[PDB]
Amino acid sequence: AKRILCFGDSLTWGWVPVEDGAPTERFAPDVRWTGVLAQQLGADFEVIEEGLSARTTNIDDPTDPRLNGASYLPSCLATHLPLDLVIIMLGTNDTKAYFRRTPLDIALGMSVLVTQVLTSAGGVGTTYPAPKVLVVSPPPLAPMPHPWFQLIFEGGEQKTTELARVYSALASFMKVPFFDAGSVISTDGVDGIHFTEANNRDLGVALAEQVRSLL
Amino acid sequence: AKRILCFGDSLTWGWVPVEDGAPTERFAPDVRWTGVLAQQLGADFEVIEEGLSARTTNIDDPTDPRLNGASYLPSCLATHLPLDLVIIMLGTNDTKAYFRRTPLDIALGMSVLVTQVLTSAGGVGTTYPAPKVLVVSPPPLAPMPHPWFQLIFEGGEQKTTELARVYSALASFMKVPFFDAGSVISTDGVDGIHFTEANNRDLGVALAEQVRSLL
Amino acid sequence: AKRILCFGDSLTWGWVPVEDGAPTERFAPDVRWTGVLAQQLGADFEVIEEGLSARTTNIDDPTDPRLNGASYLPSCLATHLPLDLVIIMLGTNDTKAYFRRTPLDIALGMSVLVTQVLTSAGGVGTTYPAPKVLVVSPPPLAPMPHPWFQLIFEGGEQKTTELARVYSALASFMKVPFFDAGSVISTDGVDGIHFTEANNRDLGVALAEQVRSLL
Amino acid sequence: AKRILCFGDSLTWGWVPVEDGAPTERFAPDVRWTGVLAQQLGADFEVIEEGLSARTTNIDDPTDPRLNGASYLPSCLATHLPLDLVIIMLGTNDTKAYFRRTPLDIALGMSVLVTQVLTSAGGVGTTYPAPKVLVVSPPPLAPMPHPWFQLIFEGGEQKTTELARVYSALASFMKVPFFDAGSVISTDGVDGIHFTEANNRDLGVALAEQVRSLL
Amino acid sequence: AKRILCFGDSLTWGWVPVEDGAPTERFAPDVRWTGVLAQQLGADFEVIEEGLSARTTNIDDPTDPRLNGASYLPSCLATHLPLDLVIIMLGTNDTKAYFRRTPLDIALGMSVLVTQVLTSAGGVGTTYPAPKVLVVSPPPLAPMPHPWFQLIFEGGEQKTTELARVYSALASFMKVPFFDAGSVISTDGVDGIHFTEANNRDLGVALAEQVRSLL
Amino acid sequence: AKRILCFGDSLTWGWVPVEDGAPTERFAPDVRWTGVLAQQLGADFEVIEEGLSARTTNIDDPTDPRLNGASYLPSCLATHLPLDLVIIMLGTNDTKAYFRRTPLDIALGMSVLVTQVLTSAGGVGTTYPAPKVLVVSPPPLAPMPHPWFQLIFEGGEQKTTELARVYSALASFMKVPFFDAGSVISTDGVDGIHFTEANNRDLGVALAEQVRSLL
Amino acid sequence: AKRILCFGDSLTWGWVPVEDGAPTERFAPDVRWTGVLAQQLGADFEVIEEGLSARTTNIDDPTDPRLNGASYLPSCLATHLPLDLVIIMLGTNDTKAYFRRTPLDIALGMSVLVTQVLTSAGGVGTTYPAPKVLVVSPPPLAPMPHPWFQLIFEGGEQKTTELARVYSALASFMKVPFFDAGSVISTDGVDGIHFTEANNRDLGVALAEQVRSLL
Amino acid sequence: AKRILCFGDSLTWGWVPVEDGAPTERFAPDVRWTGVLAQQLGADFEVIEEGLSARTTNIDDPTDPRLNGASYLPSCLATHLPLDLVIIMLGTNDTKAYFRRTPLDIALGMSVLVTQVLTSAGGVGTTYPAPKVLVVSPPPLAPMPHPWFQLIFEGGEQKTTELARVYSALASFMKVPFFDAGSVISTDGVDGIHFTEANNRDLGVALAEQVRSLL
């Protein structure tokens, strides 16, 4: 099977949106978009889910040491070789107010992750090549009923409206594939941040078409 | 399904032993012990493969920034919740000569990893409980025909013969399940480090019993 | 007895306000609010006072290495197990001009301390559970006659008027208890920062009612 | 009242020795030696319990970030002013095999803690004087039936037999009071590390005399 | 003799102002203000000159590792015990544009140095007391003909006009002596930064009167 | 031969401008300006090319650890002794938006590199003197068709228009030679950043005249 | 031309051995082995001299921040692309007594440098492939008449006699070309460390054959 | 006058040896050897006293952040320009048991200090040349009656007997003046570490000749 690594945040993990903000559970394996993707691709492909809620591109979160994408990705890639493709959808969390990041800052973080994929040939002592990469801008954020979410994401929605533009620019420069998740879904979760069942479905269907086109 | 995370090194990844040391490839999904485990357990269980070649318990490898197990595990646990059990087989690489580690030092690195599992409840914003843990001592190393392997592992065999003892002590003290992989296999790969196909099969069949016993 | 840990700053320590700013002494044990609290609760409760003047939520003070709440709290919690409740009233010092912190920054620091309490089960090698937590916003600051206090707290009063809102939001999200000290007292100390005898009394009486409600 | 701070490790916390190593509970408030001290001294004195299990003098424990005594003490001193005396019994944990410390290294860690007490006058913005200090060598360790304790403390007993000598030397040189806990008790707990009830009582009655003698 | 340590920057070292900015030489020993001070005080006093050009209160200069006052002062004080008084005139260099420091930031740096003096009793193994301290605000900067000086000191003159106010506030709070050098001289050096012969004379005469008043 | 070290960025390396931004190749050895310089100088001189694309004066690039000029230059100078002259043309990359550097910041970085040259006498165990230095401001940037270049260089063109002024000021202060590359060429590369063949020629011819004048 | 980078220490720089230890000068361009290499290879090749005296494989020298080979090499590789071959002769300096390194430690430092060459494709934004690598063990050290050299290299000769073995093992394992400089020369310089003119010539003539053989 | 900087430890400060170890006082200005030096040299010279008790060559003391000689010296040199000669007597404290240093390690720390003097020309913005340096080995330690001194200096006497040899070697190699204090005095203070009055006098009279000889 052609092997697809899906590297991302809560949107990849499958965070179930709740009115009271948190805590929550995971979408069922056949509902979250990585599951929909695997179903839509069929047996000639394998999907590997590496989504961590609250994950950033490459910036340490001051409240949680687990969240820097770039600290984890190189070890993740070597762990899962042989790979054919890495889909990265990250940057939503970089727009949290407390990071004080501009869209350029966030694209630069994404550029680090693309470079980690591109330079990943061989892993630790193997003959395996580097997989391809697909850079995916998340859909823009939406209004948030929970006061804590409103606070931590102050200015975030505006920044997320820029990610498709800056990611497409970056990907064009680096000569890698790009897809805008916002072109196929809006962020419809009740919390204004996460996905509904339909968002997951529509995104999984769309990415399957991207995956077949690249591989 | 009940979800089983296999956290390990080349032995968990499935490094095929070769006469010329390196480079190599991965054992087939049905041949590496994580696959044999999955087969044996069946559809009521799901196995998650997080094996990284050259990984240590909790010590930075000066040649490669990817290899500190404790740097990665907390992020990995939160990525894969909900989890029922985490099998950890690590410690072989800690016995490389350049780490200058005693079996006690290695057991202490293992204690960090166990503590990371025991304290992992809720991950990022979830209602999920911590998984159980199973501490696994790898089998003792054997003589190595490749001079480079002989060099980096100088003194290592003697150290690996002590890991069942020190890990059993540790696990008893921490009141967590222990299993000695060396109770069912010896290290039979031609390089004196990695597993034969028959090593992988026997370890998988033994651990399948262990998993069913704990859950 | 049910055991209450009071973790805080000068307001918890019992700093006596003085016209010349500093140096000063501590309020008598039966006057400072932690003492009033203990008297009002009676023998079925025990109060443990961990107030350090100039303490912040989780930010190092450049003039004094002792002042980061989050650096100390985990060791403090393990020291005092068994515990039933931790009252944290901090954030006033985070509003000092030289920290350049917004109310969100300060709530994020408080979130770190709440997480330390929530994850504190077992301490070092015990069977003891985690205590509950009560997040307490301090009352807003007031005008300050001393020129040095005016300087270091420039912009501070405005920020302290926001802490009840941001702390309540945070606490709601994290599903922990919240109480606004500003709902029962104003900052009446002659220095514009610290408490009078009556402030201490009124706060101690109020928190006793909170403590009985939670335990 | 005259205020006595007891800064220590599990021996000061009141770890109940158990056959199975861990986990355990705290000796009752009237049974641990800090409580016996308080009883014996009476209402003219107040004892403050700052004992943290596994605490070292001034060395980071690689398994636990909470345990460096010197990281905590200056903050602790400033928290509890006004203080009349600080009793410090530490050094047992420094003799764990993985710290690779000599009795001299441990005495030097103790010298840091003494220096922190001697230089503590005024704390944060107060008129209060520095307390006196009493350097206490713990009693020598004994044979340990639990294999994990035997491992982590390998070589430790021999080191603890030297602490009265090196701490006496240190204290004489620094011109501060010294007391050897080993002059009145042996380590009689079933685990070979911690105290029996009779150990706690005798140590409390001896230190009560020491406290009255110094103040 | 009563021993006076003069801790400062180029203004204390005795930098000779030159039209071409730099390089330059030192004022003669009987012309620079520390020399004038020693002459005016007479044999009952001794002056010790510790002025380093480009020195800041407590901030590392990115172009020169030698320049952080607070990194050096504690070692300096212990070196020169017994001392009676420490005169600190610093803060001019903190106003360089590239430090992005406000007058409050600079007073906070000065507060660190005052604390180092106040806590300096005993040095390394001595019976000697702490000296007194005199906080001295430098005179305001003036127009600068050299384009490089204009650049590095952009915004500096305005900041230096605030130092007398913030230093006096600080000194009042900390209950230490303060003197404003700007009350007796203007910065008349041709470069707009350093002192003429007359500036040095007038300052030395003034400080002699301060020294006799304190000692 | 008199030996000239050319230390710089892509402009020194000889990056070929391309419409699609990147990747690209190097200008031929006799086309890039360091080659033109060597041809124009003749056999009495030797040119040593140390140009690294994306290099800054003295600031780490968050996407690439190779790029800090000042981290490399001291080792470079000792490597190439005996030297007669070091030409440094750097600062263009410092104007990338993500560095948030002002022209002063960039001149300060250049000042570090000049100091490294001036203090380089002897290298490692030699009798060789320090070479001279020539500070060279790059020509201003131009409009950039590629969206990624537009993004990373936002505000860059304006900053690069200031470098001749700030570098000349710096060089005047430090009493070293200065030349403005912008006085002889405009940035004509199709990407708005790099040089055409004619730019390289005109710059090489100009610098040859500078080199003969200094040596 | 095919481009050959010679990455090394004093032996590559061309340190002239002197009776009095230091200071010294560089062997003439036609006399050092890098020059003899260039002569022998002719105009179809170009040799690039990157030898730094006292350089180690990958360990910071506490007396000199310039000397960590691995700190510099990645920047150096990207500077000099396009490259066909990188010759690395390092490891002599790692055998200095104060580094406390074994031959294995040194081989591991060499493995870092090899890995930096193998992973260097594209440098900064180029289409260029990675060069090949040639691992070269230096010749064993000899007795040293200067007492300072005798001191710093105590135990070093014995270590250098092992480098051909461990580097051959390493290179075989990594599947990269190896050459032992000790197979063609002994260390004949009067200081027991550096090369005679005849040493330089023979090494150059041998490596010329090696270069032609690999390209 | 010609300016002589005396950079040292307690031996340069003038620690009065006492039976009870510590605390103590400073030898009178006319009795410490720096004073005897000044007397003997007369008014054509000026001596500058920079002796700090417990100072090491270049190693942080874990009990005291003030004691790394190399951290302070560059700042000290730039403070006291113009300088003609720097006398450095250090290395005794490096032989304390807890530093685990060999005579070679200590000589290397001394080499850092020498290098700091040799490279000190111009200080901050001056036209002044570097001073000369005189490397001085302290006299060997003697038996110590105080148990704390015996402990911290265990193995130290044997090390100090080697410093004249290793420092002579170092100085010869670096081509700088050397003098052995042990050629004229033995360590005769009652504590086995510090100097008698007659020790101070003889060292001063010998160094006075050395100073006149070098200038």
**Are E58 and E113 within 8 A, CB to CB?**
yes
How many angstroms separate the CA of residue B190 from the nearest CA in chain A? 16
State the virtual CA torsion across H24, H30, H31, H37 in degrees, nearest 10: 120
**In chain F, whose CA is at the least distance from the CA of A103?**
F151
Question: Which amino acid is located at A96 in the chain?
Answer: K
What is the phi/psi pair of residue F46, to 5°? -130, 135
Long-range contacts of C16-21, Cβ-Cβ distance < 8 Å, separation of 24 or more: C16/C194, C17/C189, C17/C190, C17/C191, C17/C193, C17/C194, C17/C195, C17/C196, C18/C190, C18/C191, C19/C145, C19/C146, C19/C190, C19/C191, C20/C146, C20/E172, C20/E173, C20/E175, C21/C146, C21/C148, C21/C149, C21/C191, C21/E172, C21/E173
DSSP, residue by residue, C178-205: EEEGGGT----STTSSS--HHHHHHHHH
Indicate the residue of B58, B112, B169 with minimum beta-carbon distance to D148: B169
State the angle between helix axes of A163-174 and A103-118 in degrees (0 to 180), rounded to the nearest 10.
Answer: 40
Indicate the residue of G23, G66, G126 with minimum beta-carbon distance to F122: G23
Task: Please indicate whether, in this complex, the C-beta atoms of D126 and C26 are within 8 angstroms of each other.
Answer: yes
* E152 vs F contacts (CB less than 8 Å): 104, 108
Q: Which residues pair with G131 in a beta bridge?
A: none
**In chain G, whose CA is at the least distance from the CA of B100?**
G105
* E64 vs H contacts (CB less than 8 Å): 124
Which helix (DSSP H) or strand (DSSP E) does residue D137 occupy? strand D132-137
* D93 vs B contacts (CB less than 8 Å): none
How far is Cα of residue B75 from the mean position of the Cα atoms in its chain? 17
**In chain C, whose CA is at the least distance from the CA of E112?**
C63
How many angstroms separate the CA of residue A194 from the nearest CA in chain C? 16
Counting beta carbons within 10 angstroms of the beta carbon of residue C18, is it exposed (0 to 12), middle (13 to 18) or buried (19 or more)? Answer: middle
- Test the D interface: residue of B68, B104, B165 with most D CBs within 10 Å: B104
**In chain A, whose CA is at the least distance from the CA of C59?**
A62
Element counts in chain A: helices (H) and strands (E)? 8, 5
User: If interface means Cβ-Cβ distance under 8 Å, which residues of chain E face chain F?
Assistant: 20-23, 62-63, 97-98, 146-152, 154
- The resolution, in Å, is 1.5
Structure tokens at E150: 């204009």
**Are E54 and E91 within 8 A, CB to CB?**
no
Q: Which chains touch G (3 or more CB pairs under 8 A)?
A: B, F, H
Indicate the residue of E104, E165, E169 with minimum beta-carbon distance to C97: E104
How far is Cα of residue H145 from the mean position of the Cα atoms in its chain? 23
Task: Please indicate whether, in this complex, the C-beta atoms of A72 and B75 are within 8 angstroms of each other.
Answer: yes
Q: Which residues pair with E94 in a beta bridge?
A: none
- Whose tokens are 């790969």? That residue is B189
Indicate the residue of F105, F108, F173 with minimum beta-carbon distance to E146: F173
**In chain C, whose CA is at the least distance from the CA of E106?**
C98
**Are F129 and F171 within 8 A, CB to CB?**
no
* B97 vs G contacts (CB less than 8 Å): 102, 104
Task: Please indicate whether, in this complex, the C-beta atoms of D22 and B104 are within 8 angstroms of each other.
Answer: no
Counting beta carbons within 10 angstroms of the beta carbon of residue E19, is it exposed (0 to 12), middle (13 to 18) or buried (19 or more)? Answer: exposed
The neighbour count for residue A123, using CB atoms within 10 Å, is: 25
Question: Which amino acid is located at A179 in the chain?
Answer: F
* C21 vs E contacts (CB less than 8 Å): 172-173
Task: Please indicate whether, in this complex, the C-beta atoms of A104 and F148 are within 8 angstroms of each other.
Answer: no
Distance (Å, whole) CA C67 – CA D79 = 10
Sign of CA dihedral A37, A39, A40, A45: positive
Q: Output the furthest CA–CA distance in chain A (Å, rounded).
A: 51
Indicate the residue of B26, B71, B79 with minimum beta-carbon distance to A50: B79
Q: Where are the alpha helices (DSSP H) in chain C?
A: 10-13, 33-41, 69-80, 103-118, 147-152, 156-160, 163-174, 197-214
- Domain definitions of chain F by residue range: 1-215
Indicate the residue of G63, G98, G154 with minimum beta-carbon distance to H112: G63
Distance (Å, whole) CA D130 – CA D118 = 6
Task: Please indicate whether, in this complex, the C-beta atoms of G169 and B151 are within 8 angstroms of each other.
Answer: yes
- Test the B interface: residue of G173, G174, G178 with most B CBs within 10 Å: G173
Q: Do chains C and H touch (3 or more CB pairs under 8 A)?
A: no
Question: Which amino acid is located at G26 in the chain?
Answer: R
Q: Which residues pair with F61 in a beta bridge?
A: F64
Task: Please indicate whether, in this complex, the C-beta atoms of B115 and D63 are within 8 angstroms of each other.
Answer: yes
- Ordered strands of the G45-51 beta sheet: G45-51, G2-8, G85-89, G132-137, G178-180
DSSP, residue by residue, A31-74: TSHHHHHHHHH-TTEEEEEEE-TT-BSS--BTTBTT-BHHHHHH
Task: Please indicate whether, in this complex, the C-beta atoms of H79 and E125 are within 8 angstroms of each other.
Answer: no
Structure tokens at D32: 């641990």
Q: Which chains touch H (3 or more CB pairs under 8 A)?
A: D, E, G
Q: How many CA atoms lie within 13 A of B171 on its CB side?
A: 20
* H84 vs E contacts (CB less than 8 Å): none
**In chain B, whose CA is at the least distance from the CA of A120?**
B66
What is the architecture of the domain spanning H1-215? 3-Layer(aba) Sandwich (3.40)
Distance (Å, whole) CA H86 – CA H211 = 10
Indicate the residue of F63, F151, F154 with minimum beta-carbon distance to A112: F63
* A20 vs C contacts (CB less than 8 Å): 172-173, 175
What is the phi/psi pair of residue A12, to 5°? -80, -40
Structure tokens at F86: 């070091």
DSSP, residue by residue, E110-140: HHHHHHHHHT-TTTTTB-PPPPEEEEEEPPP
Which helix (DSSP H) or strand (DSSP E) does residue H148 occupy? helix H147-152
Residues 6 or more apart from D38 whose CB is under 8 A from it?
Answer: D45, D46, D47
Distance (Å, whole) CA A199 – CA A31 = 10
- Test the B interface: residue of A18, A52, A64 with most B CBs within 10 Å: A52
Indicate the residue of F112, F165, F168 with minimum beta-carbon distance to E63: F112
DSSP, residue by residue, B15-28: BPP-TT---B-BPP
Distance (Å, whole) CA C22 – CA C190 = 12
**In chain A, whose CA is at the least distance from the CA of F151?**
A104
Task: Please indicate whether, in this complex, the C-beta atoms of B25 and A128 are within 8 angstroms of each other.
Answer: yes
Conformational region of residue G123, where left means phi above 0, alpha means psi within -120 to 50, and beta covers everything else = left
Indicate the residue of E20, E63, E146 with minimum beta-carbon distance to F108: E63
